[PDB]
Amino acid sequence: PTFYRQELNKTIWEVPERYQNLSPVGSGAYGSVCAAFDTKTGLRVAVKKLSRPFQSIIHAKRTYRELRLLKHMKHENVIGLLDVFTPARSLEEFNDVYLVTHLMGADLNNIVKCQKLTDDHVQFLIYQILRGLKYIHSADIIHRDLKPSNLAVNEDCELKILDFGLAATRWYRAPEIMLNWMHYNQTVDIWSVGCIMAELLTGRTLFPGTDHIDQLKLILRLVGTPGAELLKKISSESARNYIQSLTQMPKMNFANVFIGANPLAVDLLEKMLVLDSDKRITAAQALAHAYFAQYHDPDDEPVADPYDQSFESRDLLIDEWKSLTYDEVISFVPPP
Ligand SMILES: O=C(CO)N1CCC(c2n[nH]c(-c3ccc(Cl)cc3)c2-c2ccncn2)CC1
Ligand SMILES: Fc1ccc(-c2c[nH]nc2-c2ccnc(F)c2)cc1
């Protein structure tokens, strides 16, 4: 189609004429986001322009990664791709990438911030995060940085997860990541959901750590210092010296810490915020918890198609990553 050009916040935007009335809404991962009206579909959309998508090998691979991830995700509670385009007419001229999705009006950081949610709202918002995570996790994808600011929400409380798989943000991070364990599992995301849910219910950051050390201190204050079963799983001499040097802490009584909350919410919280990540509830199990009795339907909580992440192990030239991304743009098929 016919492109047209404009400057918005120092940044140039060259987009097809179908997208009208571009309006800056803020920063995205590795780029800027504009709200727009899609004259073809009649949809309000969000367009992200990647900044310097092919600046280095790291950027090139990251651009490919995000495009591959967005092309794969087709789920109500996960951001997906409505369109992807470039003003470039050929591979040699290919230097910019624009990604388009449904416009979402706010995020949970905007919502919780100075606005108290009812237990009914929390059930629905957390149900939707878990339903999305079930899907993401079934594709062997980990979010790794789940936090209120990457949960997009509309005025009717429909929620989508963004910025998954790209990999303070500290506040929502699993303690095994604070300890720098490289073999963490998908349940790091469940830890983050627990932190988020706690905050939705209480109106305060559960673990507002001032650094990595402070963050673990705050976590261990609630959940206790590791037991013997967990300590035996820590290979790192240094990590063990640190953890075993702290004054032992008992696990607190969650019913007391979150007193006044729905006892079912308290129960789910204790299953999510388990120190040993092997013992944490999974997204699929969490959906079946009684807290979500009014929302849960196992016939309407789909899993994802298999997703090939083998490229992640590959070390390629910028031009190779760029060409792979270009072919992914050209092969894009929009949804129905
Ligand atoms: O922090 C803020 C605002 O202060 N924001 C929260 C994050 C928010 C945001 N970040 N990234 C996207 C995005 C856009 C298109 C694609 Cl294909 C993929 C990701 C959005 C967004 C914005 C609106 N609707 C949908 N996505 C931008 C605004
Ligand atoms: F203070 C602590 C101690 C251990 C964890 C922890 C939770 N789940 N898994 C681990 C873990 C397993 C193996 N090696 C590690 F380094 C960490 C988290 C905080």
Curated annotation (Swiss-Prot):
InterPro entries: Kinase-like_dom_sf (IPR011009), MAP_kinase (IPR050117), MAP_kinase_CS (IPR003527), MAPK14 (IPR038784), MAPK_p38-like (IPR008352), Prot_kinase_dom (IPR000719), Protein_kinase_ATP_BS (IPR017441). ATP binds at residues 25-33, 48. It catalyses: L-seryl-[protein] + ATP = O-phospho-L-seryl-[protein] + ADP + H(+); L-threonyl-[protein] + ATP = O-phospho-L-threonyl-[protein] + ADP + H(+). Changing residue 311 to S: Emulation of the active state. Increase in activity. SMART domains: S_TKc. It is found in: Cytoplasm; Nucleus. The active site is at residue 163. The modification N6-acetyllysine is found at residues 48, 147. Its cofactor is Mg(2+). Changing residue 46 to V: In a gastric adenocarcinoma sample; somatic mutation. Keywords: Acetylation, Apoptosis, ATP-binding, Cytoplasm, Kinase, Nucleotide-binding, Nucleus, Phosphoprotein, Serine/threonine-protein kinase, Stress response, Transcription, Transcription regulation, Transferase, Ubl conjugation. The modification Phosphotyrosine is found at residue 307. The modification Phosphothreonine is found at residues 11, 247. Brain, heart, placenta, pancreas and skeletal muscle. Expressed to a lesser extent in lung, liver and kidney. It holds the Pfam family Pkinase. Dual phosphorylation can also be mediated by TAB1-mediated autophosphorylation. TCR engagement in T-cells also leads to Tyr-307 phosphorylation by ZAP70. Dephosphorylated and inactivated by DUPS1, DUSP10 and DUSP16. PPM1D also mediates dephosphorylation and inactivation of MAPK14. Acetylated at Lys-48 and Lys-147 by KAT2B and EP300. Acetylation at Lys-48 increases the affinity for ATP and enhances kinase activity. Lys-48 and Lys-147 are deacetylated by HDAC3. Signal peptide: none annotated. One of its GO terms (cellular component) is secretory granule lumen. GO terms for biological process: 3'-UTR-mediated mRNA stabilization; angiogenesis; apoptotic process; bone development; cartilage condensation; cell morphogenesis; cell surface receptor protein serine/threonine kinase signaling pathway; cell surface receptor signaling pathway. Residues 19-292 form the Protein kinase domain. GO terms for molecular function: ATP binding; enzyme binding; MAP kinase activity; MAP kinase kinase activity; mitogen-activated protein kinase p38 binding; NFAT protein binding; protein phosphatase binding; protein serine kinase activity. PANTHER family: MITOGEN-ACTIVATED PROTEIN KINASE (PTHR24055). Belongs to the protein kinase superfamily. CMGC Ser/Thr protein kinase family. MAP kinase subfamily. Component of a signaling complex containing at least AKAP13, PKN1, MAPK14, ZAK and MAP2K3. Within this complex, AKAP13 interacts directly with PKN1, which in turn recruits MAPK14, MAP2K3 and ZAK. Binds to a kinase interaction motif within the protein tyrosine phosphatase, PTPRR. This interaction retains MAPK14 in the cytoplasm and prevents nuclear accumulation. Interacts with SPAG9 and GADD45A. Interacts with CDC25B, CDC25C, DUSP1, DUSP10, DUSP16, NP60, SUPT20H and TAB1. Interacts with casein kinase II subunits CSNK2A1 and CSNK2B. Interacts with PPM1D. The TXY motif contains the threonine and tyrosine residues whose phosphorylation activates the MAP kinases. This is Mitogen-activated protein kinase 14.
